[PDB]
Amino acid sequence: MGPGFDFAQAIMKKNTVIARTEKGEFTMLGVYDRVAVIPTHASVGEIIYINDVETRVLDACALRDLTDTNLEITIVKLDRNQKFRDIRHFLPRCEDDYNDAVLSVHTSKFPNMYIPVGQVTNYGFLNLGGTPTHRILMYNFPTRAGQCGGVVTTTGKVIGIHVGGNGAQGFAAMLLHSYFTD
């Protein structure tokens, strides 16, 4: 409807796939080459489905900060015959707060879904499903099951992926440029 949704749409149309694990169907953001991210609670194994095609996982790394605290981001390298558009230049360099964010989801259950979630707070620490977690972003929208892996954007920035909620608020793990240096 406006320039927030335009950026969000441009990211969904070229940089997302539908990932399926034994734990469910997820929105999966492709970042560059054959490298994508997914919530760690997806429990990525040796094999994953990408748009319903059996795909070998060349590497999977559950990120933790330097205090050995969960960040809830898994970086996956896929044995895929095609590269993603490189969007690493849209990733923030530091932890921050944001105005006027959009959460975008694309699954079988929720195709072409966009939610204006408004202000995003640098929440920091969250006990997420009983797991101490750092670098959490919070927005005040009643996010539901099926939205995990959803991409959080502002105009010009891809800032996080949705990893949970409590009925009233939603929570995203931060994406930082330094996760994807090679």
Short mmCIF file of C-alpha atoms in Angstrom, two decimals:
data_model
loop_
_atom_site.label_atom_id
_atom_site.label_comp_id
_atom_site.label_asym_id
_atom_site.label_seq_id
_atom_site.Cartn_x
_atom_site.Cartn_y
_atom_site.Cartn_z
CA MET A 1 0.00 0.00 0.00
CA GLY A 2 3.05 2.33 0.65
CA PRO A 3 6.91 2.33 0.48
CA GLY A 4 7.25 -0.07 3.50
CA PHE A 5 5.18 -2.80 1.77
CA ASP A 6 7.06 -2.12 -1.58
CA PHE A 7 10.50 -2.98 -0.04
CA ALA A 8 8.95 -5.97 1.85
CA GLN A 9 7.42 -7.25 -1.43
CA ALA A 10 10.75 -6.88 -3.34
CA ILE A 11 12.45 -9.05 -0.62
CA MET A 12 9.66 -11.73 -0.61
CA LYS A 13 9.50 -12.07 -4.46
CA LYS A 14 13.27 -12.83 -4.95
CA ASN A 15 14.80 -13.78 -1.52
CA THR A 16 12.33 -16.32 0.08
CA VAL A 17 11.62 -20.04 -0.26
CA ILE A 18 9.22 -22.31 1.67
CA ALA A 19 11.36 -24.54 3.95
CA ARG A 20 9.86 -27.74 5.48
CA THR A 21 11.51 -29.70 8.36
CA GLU A 22 10.03 -32.41 10.71
CA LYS A 23 8.99 -29.42 12.94
CA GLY A 24 6.83 -27.72 10.21
CA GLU A 25 6.67 -25.28 7.27
CA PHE A 26 8.72 -21.98 7.63
CA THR A 27 9.33 -18.79 5.65
CA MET A 28 13.11 -18.96 4.89
CA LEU A 29 15.10 -15.79 3.94
CA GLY A 30 17.86 -16.35 1.31
CA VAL A 31 20.76 -13.88 2.00
CA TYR A 32 23.46 -14.60 -0.69
CA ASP A 33 24.82 -17.50 -2.82
CA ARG A 34 23.14 -20.69 -1.40
CA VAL A 35 23.06 -19.35 2.21
CA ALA A 36 19.70 -18.85 4.03
CA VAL A 37 18.47 -18.38 7.65
CA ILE A 38 15.67 -20.16 9.62
CA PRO A 39 14.70 -20.22 13.34
CA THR A 40 16.87 -22.76 15.28
CA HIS A 41 13.62 -24.38 16.64
CA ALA A 42 13.05 -25.58 12.96
CA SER A 43 15.69 -28.27 13.92
CA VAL A 44 17.35 -28.38 10.44
CA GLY A 45 18.86 -31.84 9.68
CA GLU A 46 20.91 -33.40 6.81
CA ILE A 47 17.91 -33.07 4.42
CA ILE A 48 15.31 -30.22 4.15
CA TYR A 49 12.44 -29.55 1.61
CA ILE A 50 12.77 -26.23 -0.34
CA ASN A 51 9.54 -25.42 -2.28
CA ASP A 52 8.63 -29.18 -1.83
CA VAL A 53 11.95 -30.43 -3.37
CA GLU A 54 14.29 -32.74 -1.37
CA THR A 55 17.51 -30.71 -0.74
CA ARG A 56 20.82 -31.78 0.91
CA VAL A 57 22.01 -29.39 3.69
CA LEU A 58 25.75 -28.70 3.02
CA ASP A 59 26.11 -26.90 6.39
CA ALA A 60 23.89 -25.73 9.31
CA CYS A 61 25.09 -23.49 12.20
CA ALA A 62 22.92 -22.55 15.23
CA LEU A 63 24.31 -19.09 16.16
CA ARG A 64 25.16 -18.23 19.82
CA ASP A 65 26.67 -14.95 21.18
CA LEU A 66 30.13 -14.87 22.83
CA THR A 67 28.53 -15.63 26.29
CA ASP A 68 27.23 -18.96 24.73
CA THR A 69 23.57 -17.66 24.74
CA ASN A 70 21.09 -18.82 22.02
CA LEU A 71 20.40 -16.24 19.22
CA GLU A 72 17.66 -18.53 17.63
CA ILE A 73 19.15 -18.07 14.09
CA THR A 74 20.40 -21.10 12.13
CA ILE A 75 22.46 -20.30 9.00
CA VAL A 76 21.92 -23.01 6.34
CA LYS A 77 23.95 -23.66 3.19
CA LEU A 78 21.68 -25.48 0.66
CA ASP A 79 22.78 -27.92 -2.11
CA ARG A 80 20.69 -25.88 -4.60
CA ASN A 81 21.41 -25.29 -8.35
CA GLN A 82 20.65 -21.53 -8.09
CA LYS A 83 21.99 -18.58 -5.99
CA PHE A 84 19.92 -15.94 -4.15
CA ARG A 85 20.22 -12.28 -5.06
CA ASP A 86 22.85 -10.84 -2.62
CA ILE A 87 20.95 -8.67 -0.02
CA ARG A 88 23.75 -8.44 2.61
CA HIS A 89 24.01 -4.67 1.91
CA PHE A 90 20.39 -4.35 3.40
CA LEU A 91 21.49 -5.87 6.78
CA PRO A 92 22.08 -3.57 9.78
CA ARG A 93 25.62 -3.41 11.22
CA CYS A 94 24.53 -2.83 14.90
CA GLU A 95 21.69 -3.64 17.37
CA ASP A 96 19.01 -0.88 17.12
CA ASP A 97 15.34 0.20 17.50
CA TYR A 98 13.22 0.90 14.34
CA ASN A 99 9.98 2.66 13.33
CA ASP A 100 7.27 1.38 10.94
CA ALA A 101 8.35 -2.26 10.32
CA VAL A 102 6.53 -4.90 8.19
CA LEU A 103 6.45 -8.66 8.96
CA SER A 104 6.07 -10.70 5.69
CA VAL A 105 5.23 -14.49 5.59
CA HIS A 106 4.90 -16.90 2.66
CA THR A 107 3.77 -20.53 3.36
CA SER A 108 1.03 -22.93 2.05
CA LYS A 109 -1.09 -21.80 5.04
CA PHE A 110 -0.25 -18.03 4.68
CA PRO A 111 0.67 -17.01 1.08
CA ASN A 112 1.54 -13.34 0.28
CA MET A 113 0.87 -12.19 3.91
CA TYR A 114 2.14 -8.70 5.01
CA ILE A 115 1.54 -7.17 8.53
CA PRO A 116 2.40 -3.54 9.44
CA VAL A 117 3.71 -4.19 13.01
CA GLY A 118 4.69 -0.54 13.78
CA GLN A 119 7.51 0.33 16.26
CA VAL A 120 10.23 -2.34 16.89
CA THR A 121 12.03 -2.20 20.31
CA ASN A 122 15.55 -3.60 21.01
CA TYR A 123 14.14 -5.90 23.74
CA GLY A 124 17.40 -7.88 24.26
CA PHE A 125 16.88 -10.80 26.67
CA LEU A 126 13.87 -13.17 26.24
CA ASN A 127 13.12 -16.54 27.82
CA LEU A 128 11.80 -18.03 24.54
CA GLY A 129 10.01 -21.37 25.12
CA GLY A 130 12.20 -21.82 28.27
CA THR A 131 15.51 -21.01 26.40
CA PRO A 132 17.47 -17.86 27.43
CA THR A 133 17.80 -15.85 24.14
CA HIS A 134 19.66 -12.57 23.27
CA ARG A 135 19.30 -9.85 20.55
CA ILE A 136 15.46 -10.03 20.48
CA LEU A 137 13.39 -7.37 18.66
CA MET A 138 9.80 -6.82 19.99
CA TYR A 139 6.70 -5.43 18.18
CA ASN A 140 3.15 -5.05 19.63
CA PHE A 141 1.13 -7.27 17.22
CA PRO A 142 -0.71 -10.54 18.17
CA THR A 143 1.40 -12.84 15.91
CA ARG A 144 0.18 -16.51 15.67
CA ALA A 145 1.49 -19.99 14.77
CA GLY A 146 2.60 -20.21 11.06
CA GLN A 147 4.52 -16.86 11.12
CA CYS A 148 7.98 -18.13 12.37
CA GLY A 149 10.78 -17.33 9.86
CA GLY A 150 8.74 -14.34 8.62
CA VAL A 151 10.92 -11.46 7.45
CA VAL A 152 10.98 -8.17 9.41
CA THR A 153 11.82 -5.13 7.20
CA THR A 154 11.79 -1.34 7.25
CA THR A 155 12.32 0.75 4.06
CA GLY A 156 15.90 -0.10 3.01
CA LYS A 157 16.67 -2.67 5.81
CA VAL A 158 16.10 -6.43 6.52
CA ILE A 159 16.36 -6.35 10.37
CA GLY A 160 15.22 -9.82 11.66
CA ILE A 161 13.20 -13.07 11.40
CA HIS A 162 10.08 -13.81 13.55
CA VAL A 163 10.81 -16.51 16.22
CA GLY A 164 7.79 -16.28 18.61
CA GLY A 165 5.10 -14.36 20.53
CA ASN A 166 3.04 -14.35 23.80
CA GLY A 167 -0.46 -13.58 22.37
CA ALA A 168 0.00 -9.73 22.61
CA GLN A 169 3.62 -9.14 21.40
CA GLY A 170 5.76 -10.72 18.62
CA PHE A 171 9.55 -11.40 18.80
CA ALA A 172 12.23 -11.52 16.05
CA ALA A 173 15.92 -12.52 16.18
CA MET A 174 18.18 -9.71 14.85
CA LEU A 175 20.01 -10.19 11.53
CA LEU A 176 23.43 -8.43 11.55
CA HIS A 177 25.82 -7.93 8.57
CA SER A 178 28.66 -9.61 10.63
CA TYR A 179 26.74 -12.97 10.64
CA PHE A 180 27.27 -13.20 6.82
CA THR A 181 30.88 -12.04 6.16
CA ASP A 182 32.84 -14.68 4.10
#
